[PDB]
Design an enzyme around this catalytic site. Structure first.
Site, PDB file in Angstrom:
ATOM      1  N   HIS A  40       0.724  -1.252   0.000  1.00 36.23           N
ATOM      2  CA  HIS A  40       0.000   0.000   0.000  1.00 36.23           C
ATOM      3  C   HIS A  40       0.766   1.326   0.000  1.00 36.23           C
ATOM      4  O   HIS A  40       0.189   2.413  -0.136  1.00 36.23           O
ATOM      5  CB  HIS A  40      -0.963  -0.001   1.211  1.00 36.23           C
ATOM      6  CG  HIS A  40      -2.256  -0.788   1.023  1.00 36.23           C
ATOM      7  ND1 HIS A  40      -3.334  -0.476   0.314  1.00 36.23           N
ATOM      8  CD2 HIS A  40      -2.490  -2.000   1.600  1.00 36.23           C
ATOM      9  CE1 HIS A  40      -4.214  -1.445   0.429  1.00 36.23           C
ATOM     10  NE2 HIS A  40      -3.684  -2.349   1.202  1.00 36.23           N
ATOM     11  N   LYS A  86      -9.168  13.968   3.555  1.00 36.41           N
ATOM     12  CA  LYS A  86      -8.314  12.796   3.593  1.00 36.41           C
ATOM     13  C   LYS A  86      -7.519  12.926   4.888  1.00 36.41           C
ATOM     14  O   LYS A  86      -7.534  13.988   5.489  1.00 36.41           O
ATOM     15  CB  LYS A  86      -7.329  12.794   2.441  1.00 36.41           C
ATOM     16  CG  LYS A  86      -6.449  14.038   2.229  1.00 36.41           C
ATOM     17  CD  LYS A  86      -5.687  14.099   0.915  1.00 36.41           C
ATOM     18  CE  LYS A  86      -6.652  14.226  -0.279  1.00 36.41           C
ATOM     19  NZ  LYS A  86      -6.808  13.021  -1.067  1.00 36.41           N
ATOM     20  N   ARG A  87      -6.827  11.889   5.344  1.00 36.45           N
ATOM     21  CA  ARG A  87      -6.019  11.975   6.530  1.00 36.45           C
ATOM     22  C   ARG A  87      -4.930  13.060   6.468  1.00 36.45           C
ATOM     23  O   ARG A  87      -4.240  13.196   5.446  1.00 36.45           O
ATOM     24  CB  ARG A  87      -5.439  10.610   6.723  1.00 36.45           C
ATOM     25  CG  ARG A  87      -5.219  10.229   8.147  1.00 36.45           C
ATOM     26  CD  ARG A  87      -6.522  10.015   8.949  1.00 36.45           C
ATOM     27  NE  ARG A  87      -6.360   8.855   9.828  1.00 36.45           N
ATOM     28  CZ  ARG A  87      -5.468   8.809  10.807  1.00 36.45           C
ATOM     29  NH1 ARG A  87      -4.736   9.858  11.166  1.00 36.45           N
ATOM     30  NH2 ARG A  87      -5.357   7.714  11.484  1.00 36.45           N
ATOM     31  N   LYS A 139       0.591  14.521   1.536  1.00 35.92           N
ATOM     32  CA  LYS A 139      -0.715  14.842   0.977  1.00 35.92           C
ATOM     33  C   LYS A 139      -0.868  16.315   0.600  1.00 35.92           C
ATOM     34  O   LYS A 139      -1.720  16.718  -0.198  1.00 35.92           O
ATOM     35  CB  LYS A 139      -1.781  14.463   1.988  1.00 35.92           C
ATOM     36  CG  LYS A 139      -1.977  12.976   1.869  1.00 35.92           C
ATOM     37  CD  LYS A 139      -2.904  12.436   2.906  1.00 35.92           C
ATOM     38  CE  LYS A 139      -3.567  11.248   2.243  1.00 35.92           C
ATOM     39  NZ  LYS A 139      -3.521  10.138   3.144  1.00 35.92           N
ATOM     40  N   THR A 142      -8.187   6.759  -3.177  1.00 28.72           N
ATOM     41  CA  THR A 142      -9.549   6.338  -3.542  1.00 28.72           C
ATOM     42  C   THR A 142     -10.566   7.469  -3.377  1.00 28.72           C
ATOM     43  O   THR A 142     -11.633   7.445  -4.000  1.00 28.72           O
ATOM     44  CB  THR A 142      -9.919   5.058  -2.727  1.00 28.72           C
ATOM     45  OG1 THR A 142      -9.334   5.218  -1.426  1.00 28.72           O
ATOM     46  CG2 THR A 142      -9.434   3.730  -3.411  1.00 28.72           C
ATOM     47  N   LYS A 173     -13.979   8.704  -5.719  1.00 30.29           N
ATOM     48  CA  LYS A 173     -15.287   9.062  -5.163  1.00 30.29           C
ATOM     49  C   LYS A 173     -15.790  10.410  -5.685  1.00 30.29           C
ATOM     50  O   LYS A 173     -16.968  10.654  -5.951  1.00 30.29           O
ATOM     51  CB  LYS A 173     -15.189   9.113  -3.637  1.00 30.29           C
ATOM     52  CG  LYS A 173     -14.750   7.838  -2.912  1.00 30.29           C
ATOM     53  CD  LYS A 173     -14.376   8.032  -1.451  1.00 30.29           C
ATOM     54  CE  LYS A 173     -13.775   6.710  -0.962  1.00 30.29           C
ATOM     55  NZ  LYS A 173     -13.417   6.932   0.416  1.00 30.29           N
TER      56      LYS A 173
HETATM   57  C1  LIG Z   1     -12.143   6.968   0.853  1.00 30.63           C
HETATM   58  C2  LIG Z   1     -11.713   7.513   2.168  1.00 30.63           C
HETATM   59  C3  LIG Z   1     -10.391   7.778   2.400  1.00 30.63           C
HETATM   60  C4  LIG Z   1      -9.341   7.625   1.339  1.00 30.63           C
HETATM   61  O1  LIG Z   1      -9.130   8.930   0.740  1.00 30.63           O
HETATM   62  P1  LIG Z   1      -7.732   9.291   0.092  1.00 30.63           P
HETATM   63  O2  LIG Z   1      -7.913  10.588  -0.577  1.00 30.63           O
HETATM   64  O3  LIG Z   1      -7.455   8.190  -0.850  1.00 30.63           O
HETATM   65  O4  LIG Z   1      -6.817   9.342   1.236  1.00 30.63           O
HETATM   66  C5  LIG Z   1      -9.994   8.242   3.608  1.00 30.63           C
HETATM   67  N1  LIG Z   1     -10.929   8.428   4.609  1.00 30.63           N
HETATM   68  C6  LIG Z   1     -12.221   8.275   4.336  1.00 30.63           C
HETATM   69  C7  LIG Z   1     -13.278   8.542   5.390  1.00 30.63           C
HETATM   70  C8  LIG Z   1     -12.646   7.787   3.170  1.00 30.63           C
HETATM   71  O5  LIG Z   1     -13.973   7.580   3.025  1.00 30.63           O
END
Ligand SMILES: *Cc1c(COP(=O)(O)O)cnc(C)c1O
Ligand SMILES: Nc1ncnc2c1ncn2[C@@H]1O[C@H](COP(=O)(O)O)[C@@H](O)[C@H]1O
Ligand SMILES: Nc1ncnc2c1ncn2[C@@H]1O[C@H](COP(=O)(O)O)[C@@H](O)[C@H]1O
Ligand SMILES: Nc1ncnc2c1ncn2[C@@H]1O[C@H](COP(=O)(O)O)[C@@H](O)[C@H]1O
Ligand SMILES: Nc1ncnc2c1ncn2[C@@H]1O[C@H](COP(=O)(O)O)[C@@H](O)[C@H]1O
Ligand SMILES: *Cc1c(COP(=O)(O)O)cnc(C)c1O
Lengths: 832, 832
Positions: free
Chosen positions: B367, B558-559, B564, B666, B670
């Protein structure tokens, strides 16, 4: 063949039950017939029986909210419930329809009831009392509430390894509990430590830690009258906030792992029977029940038709006419300073006015006179953990000793003896003084116990307030203790006098007209015989055994203690062993002596007494010369569901407490109602029972209370007994020689030094009279017909020892409440 | 007005639902209409929806037991499920009938779905992947099993106090979980510590402590095909015995309180995203999933139609054709030495023969390439806790480096670089080397990430075994991420192309014939507008807000991490702030910049970055000259159910990772499927997405992977950027002057020294291209019609990013399994 009046096996309701049973296996259990175990089947049955309960429980509670009764809260730190399945069917009259329904689903209901785990949330007597009371408050139609701790580990499971008790954690919640309804919705906070600031108008309990009290409710069904009352049991839960919040930045993860420190308050029940241990975790358990319960009580008063009513203040000068709280022993004594704290500090009532309200609401049951059982909390421990409640206990002592002073002018020793504060090097608070001072009623649990209280431990209190002191002799519930564990006996009695006796036990008197009735003698001795055959095989199957069913089943089952004198019974058993080995071809009435019960861990003497019994069983049961004649057995892990199995099969009940130590006893009554004959001293409720059946239909021996007192004045010297009785001296020599301990000869030399040099319970002083009284027992067992007719004189006179009688008197003479036999209308709903 | 194809509101099933709902409020909940809360109503609905699941779940599992598929076990330490209620109705087509049924019971179903707590059993990406996979394995008809830990506290709830994150414990289990089925019946033991004795024939793991693994199962329903698969989540439970037994006689009560030490293994999820912490409790969590899961796997192989079949041995040379285990990251790597331990030590297979079986069963997903995320366990810690698994990891290293040696003769540095044992002062085991060595397949999660692996971190491994390395680009589930969170968009697409696209997302291509179709342009921009109005008011109601709905909703959620580059977005936001304050009567496209996400506690920089954002919001949002024009918001407690609310309402998706750091992403997908336009670098799956919509229908900027490498060879000097760009230099001065921190001017001087002196992610090197690319975004938002037609080019090309595609390729190219769209027959029962 059973089919007694366990009610009707109605074709309709049998089709309704098989249907709902199959529904829960599928929807609730998510299991199919070719993968469900007995336990799956037990659970589907539990959930189906529990479904017939809930419209009655929702209706009973809706009913008390509109009808607004005075409510009775019974505060106890123990509720020794045992299993719920059979009881609920007894009370709801479902027992024959569900044994049919399971018969036809192909299952054996009696097999599935054995999968149920006991709720072992109590230690012995005090907690089974609380549980018998609950059933009788529900059967007498009272708006009553049991409040306790939801412990995850109840009393330990006893394993005997090498003759020794080995404790194991009672993990009763593992597979789930179908009978509780968690209500997190209704969680309340409990505060600990902090400090007090006395600012402007008053005191403020500041900077406290918070533990959350989470409620879990169990239905308590009355006998066949549609009333289902609640037992509310509190669980400890950490707050979501400070546990992490504030600068407890010694790890986020460690902070989450430390939630446990606070959830530990309801982790486990303290395993001690009649013994106080001044442990901070016990005081948190005690304060935690009281704080969350009192918030629930004040909230139902405020918001129960007073919710509507204003025009001046929330007037708590109606609170004693709307509320009763019964204190089961002094383990809830903190209810007194806690009701004062909310009333004075929170509602800002005046002290005198809040005190009068507290006294008229509160009442206290004392359960023992033995000193080491009494709760005397270290005041260093009370003001760290509860600094405001120590202020309040000081104020109360001050005003009370000013009442004493004024009525006994100059009697400076009375003042120091009545004080709730025991000045000593470790100043302590005597919780029973607290309870007497803040309750309008104080009661003993048997008339002799209640007289001992008035004449010796609380005599200063009795002459200050004669009016507080009462008696309410204990009771046993005839539902569990007669029709649930002995359906055979209940059938043969009902067959002659009817079924109205299960809610009116005094009716058993009508059986007196069948002591001279032959059909009844064959029936009373035949049930006794089936029950003995059914317990013989219980031990060969569940524990590999071969006891002989034709012997006199001699049983003493109760918590292991020195005052209970399992050791005297031990001394009886090796006499009889030795009489046999000296005159071996002399006939003697055969017996199986069964002794069982739990010892607290660390009660070293009680743990030695278990080891002595199994060591007498190792020798006695493997002597070829003895044979059928004598078998000594330790009945491992005695608990409520074992008690429903061994008290029906007993012939002889052994209640041999030194006189004035056992406050009442209730095993007492369980055996008398189930057809055993009692050997006993004039102690506790034994006195009342011999009074009800006639002294002559009982086997009394030993010192009476005056005689122990006459012997203590002299000084008790056991060397005199040893010296005067050869049979005794021989037992002592065998014990100290290593007769019962070959490989380790000096193993029981602690019990010998105890007996010989510092026996508080005077075992040897009651020994001659006990061996002699035991000869008379065997003489009558030889006469079957006549053993059975005094058994009928005991069963027929057991009515006084039903808890419905006890509770109808607590109701009238203390709670100021009236008992009803009437059926609550309670069907339920329907629409399309 | 909704009523999309959320299915049918069948009159019959609506009467059936209202009936069962009312049943659970009464029988399950023990509540009446004049005392039930919304939460009571939420629970009755959850239990009624859950009832339509169970005949399908019992049938699916009965079905795999007789049909005996190869089973796929997906081992993961995170499953980021979120809420289950709406999803189950989407998948079971119950959504319109239950909104009718609750409409008529008078309730608002959308109100009751908000009472559901998220299952936040994961941290971000890796765990949402595991959860998206589950839905797609169930929809593709695969005999698949998710296995994880049942944590009582999932990822913490973030509170911002004074601009700072404050963590709170996620107490998701408080009110209960209607979707799990505890199965204590199926508890298994896990061993820790102990020692090894090599006796006679072989090794023996002796004197271990035992922790019990207790299973809890949740149903995973496929989209409308009657398949309901299981996620099995293990809880840690103390043994009833040693916890007290043996000489742990330091208190009976303390012994019971210490059960917690062992139940702590599943107490909480470690809160770190892409970061390894070599904590013993994490290694116990890792070993605990693997040990209990592997016993469950071996037991279903043995006793699944091989249960019948003897005649030689239990032949595990069928085990890879009956079993697949997917390792989600290296957190389950202990599955390799554990399968070797049972096979060699327990089943007494030969090493070579057990190894071949382990490799052909196992497969590994990497990952990230970032170093600090990689798991390198201290060997002092492995042989205390698992002494046999360290023997087994040593043997494996030895045989593997003998394979390397033989193929690259004399290349002594290759040997030392390929070793699973990192010799250093604190000798460690590299778990990713372990996983490559014991898996027949290793895969990246985006094609660029997978090429980086082959060319840089695992290049030695790739030239030794080219054949292990693969790619499987991630996916998102169109059920939750399109029809569950955006029913408006799903309606307008279905209305033109039908509904077959939700299980076949590539069908979205047909929408390309409506980019030049006007009815469709009004519809695509109107849903976007309703969703924005519905999120505007979400914050004013649930958090008091007034954002402007006509602005460009610019969101990065995102985190919180430095790679990032929330900080680059921060640098963009104050440029724009300063352009406005310099030319205030110049028109600019208005925007609401929303940034949200969780920081690990103790990731000090990430915690400073949150404080920087809220500090830009304190100034920007209270400047009278700015007005509508710019609003900076921190979106508190970003989690899966907030993501279903803010990704539908977004206009701009911000995916600005430094190239070669984000392995796939991911959130990426979305936002592309829900109608936002992406600003981004050529990183992770962004590369694949721009390839699917056309580079031109995307907004790419910044360095490509070669350019970061070309800049690291030179050496990155940020003083050059500061020096060459005035706009940047000014941001830095404001930051270090205290413009954003008046009372504490040197508060953000850590982020300035980081940016200026040791910025690993080269923020300043991508700044000019990012501000320029951001001008082009605003230029097109000004052209509504044309912003909407490239949105349609993004939605219409999103098909590749469905997890059904990802999983149909894992199935074929690694598990050797075939996907089905067919409906399992699954009705249920009936009889009278
Ligand atoms: C999908 C999702 C992520 C992944 O988002 P990235 O932009 O790929 O880090 C992180 N947290 C939540 C709550 C998500 O639904
Ligand atoms: N506010 C109310 N309105 C109507 N019925 C109520 C109300 N409060 C309580 N009741 C009914 O009385 C019961 C008493 O609740 P409790 O006070 O918790 O023992 C409730 O379960 C309802 O049946
Ligand atoms: N029920 C009991 N009766 C008499 N002594 C006891 C009892 N329980 C404990 N003890 C003594 O009190 C101490 C504290 O109690 P425990 O740890 O429960 O045994 C023990 O160490 C013994 O010295
Ligand atoms: N021994 C068996 N006999 C019949 N059906 C079984 C048996 N074992 C499993 N099944 C069925 O297959 C399911 C598989 O169980 P599991 O192996 O735990 O995933 C069970 O729930 C039953 O439906
Ligand atoms: N995700 C992270 N990224 C970078 N550094 C981190 C991260 N998490 C923690 N750290 C650093 O690693 C240490 C251990 O992790 P934690 O206690 O989770 O912060 C912290 O004290 C910081 O020095
Ligand atoms: C009734 C009961 C007791 C009380 O018996 P006593 O002889 O009064 O001590 C103790 N334990 C159990 C299990 C009981 O059922």
């Amino acid at each position: 063949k059973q089919i007694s009046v366990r009610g009707l096996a109605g074709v309709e309701n049998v089709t309704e039950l098989k249907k709902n049973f199959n529904r829960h296996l599928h929807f609730t259990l998510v299991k199919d017939r070719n993968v469900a175990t007995p336990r799956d089947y037990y659970f589907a049955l539990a959930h189906t029986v529990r479904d017939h309960l809930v419209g009655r429980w929702i209706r009973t509670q809706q009913h008390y909210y509109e009808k607004d009764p005075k409510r009775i809260y019974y505060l106890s730190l123990e509720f020794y419930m045992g299993r719920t399945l059979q009881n609920t069917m007894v009370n709801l009259a479902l027992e024959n329809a569900c044994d049919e329904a399971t018969y036809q689903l192909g299952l054996d209901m009696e097999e599935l009831e054995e999968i149920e785990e006991d709720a072992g949330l109590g230690n012995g007597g005090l907690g089974r009392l609380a549980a018998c009371f609950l059933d009788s408050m529900a059967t007498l139609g009272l708006a009553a509430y049991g409040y306790g701790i939801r412990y995850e580990f109840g009393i330990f499971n006893q394993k005997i390894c090498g003759g020794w008790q080995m404790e194991e954690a009672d993990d009763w919640l593992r597979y789930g509990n179908p009978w509780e309804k968690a209500r997190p919705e209704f969680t309340l906070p409990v505060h600990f430590y902090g400090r007090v600031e006395h600012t402007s108008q008053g005191a403020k309990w500041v900077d406290t830690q918070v533990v959350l009290a989470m409620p879990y409710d169990t239905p308590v069904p009355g006998y066949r009258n549609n009333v289902v009352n609640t037992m509310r049991l509190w669980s400890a839960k950490a707050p979501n906030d400070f546990n992490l919040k504030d600068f407890n930045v010694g790890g986020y993860i460690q902070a989450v792992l430390d939630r446990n420190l606070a959830e530990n308050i309801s982790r486990v029940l303290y395993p001690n029977d009649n013994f106080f241990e001044g442990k901070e975790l016990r005081l948190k358990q005690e304060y935690f029940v009281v704080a969350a319960t009192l918030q629930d009580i004040i909230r139902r008063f405020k918001s129960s038709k007073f919710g509507c009513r204003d025009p001046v203040r929330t007037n708590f000068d109606a609170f004693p006419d709307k509320v009763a709280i019964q204190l089961n022993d002094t383990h809830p004594s903190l209810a007194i300073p806690e009701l004062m704290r909310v009333l004075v500090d929170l509602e800002r009532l005046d002290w005198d006015k809040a005190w009068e309200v507290t006294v008229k609401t509160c009442a206290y049951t004392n359960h023992t006179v033995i000193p080491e059982a009494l709760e005397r909390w270290p005041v260093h421990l009370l003001e760290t953990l509860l600094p405001r409640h120590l202020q309040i206990i000081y104020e109360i002592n001050q005003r009370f000793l000013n009442r004493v002073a004024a009525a006994f002018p100059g009697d400076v020793d009375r003042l120091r003896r009545m004080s709730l504060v025991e000045e000593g090097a470790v100043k302590r608070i005597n919780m029973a003084h607290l309870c007497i001072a803040g309750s309008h009623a104080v009661n003993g649990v048997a008339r002799i116990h209640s007289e001992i209280l008035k004449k010796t431990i609380f005599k200063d209190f009795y002459e200050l307030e004669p009016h507080k002191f009462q008696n309410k002799t204990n009771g046993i519930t005839p539902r569990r203790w007669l029709v649930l564990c002995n359906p055979g006996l209940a059938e043969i009695i009902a067959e002659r006098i009817g079924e109205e006796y299960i809610s009116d036990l005094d009716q058993l008197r009508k059986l007196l007209s069948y002591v001279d009735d032959e059909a009844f003698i064959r029936d009373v001795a035949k049930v006794k015989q089936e029950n003995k055959l059914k317990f013989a095989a219980y031990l060969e199957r569940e524990y590999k055994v071969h006891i002989n069913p034709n012997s006199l089943f001699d049983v003493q089952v109760k918590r292991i203690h020195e005052y209970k004198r399992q050791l005297l019974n031990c001394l009886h058993v090796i006499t009889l062993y030795n009489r046999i080995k000296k005159e071996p071809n002399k006939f003697v009435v055969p017996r199986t002596v069964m002794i069982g019960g739990k010892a607290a861990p660390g009660y070293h003497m009680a743990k030695m007494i278990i080891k002595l019994i199994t060591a007498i069983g190792d020798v006695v049961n493997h002597d070829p010369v003895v044979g059928d004649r004598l078998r000594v057995i330790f009945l491992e892990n005695y608990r409520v569901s074992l008690a429903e199995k061994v008290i029906p099969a007993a012939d002889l009940s052994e209640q041999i407490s030194t006189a004035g130590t056992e406050a009442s006893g209730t095993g007492n009554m369980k055996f008398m109602l189930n057809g055993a004959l009692t050997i006993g001293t004039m102690d506790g409720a034994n006195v009342e029972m011999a009074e009800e059946a006639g002294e002559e239909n009982f086997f009394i021996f030993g010192m009476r209370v005056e005689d122990v007192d006459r012997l203590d004045q002299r000084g008790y010297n056991a060397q005199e007994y040893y010296d005067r009785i050869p049979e005794l001296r021989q037992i002592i020599e065998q014990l100290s020689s290593g007769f019962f301990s070959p490989k380790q000869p000096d193993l029981f030399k602690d019990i010998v030094n105890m007996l010989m040099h510092h026996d508080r319970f005077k075992v040897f002083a009651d020994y001659e009279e006990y061996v002699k009284c035991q000869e008379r027992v065997s003489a009558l067992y030889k006469n079957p017909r006549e053993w059975t007719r005094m058994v009928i004189r005991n069963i027929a006179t057991s009515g006084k020892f039903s808890s419905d009688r006890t509770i109808a008197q607590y109701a009238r003479e203390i709670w100021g409440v009236e008992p009803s036999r009437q059926r609550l209308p309670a069907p339920d709903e329907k629409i399309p």
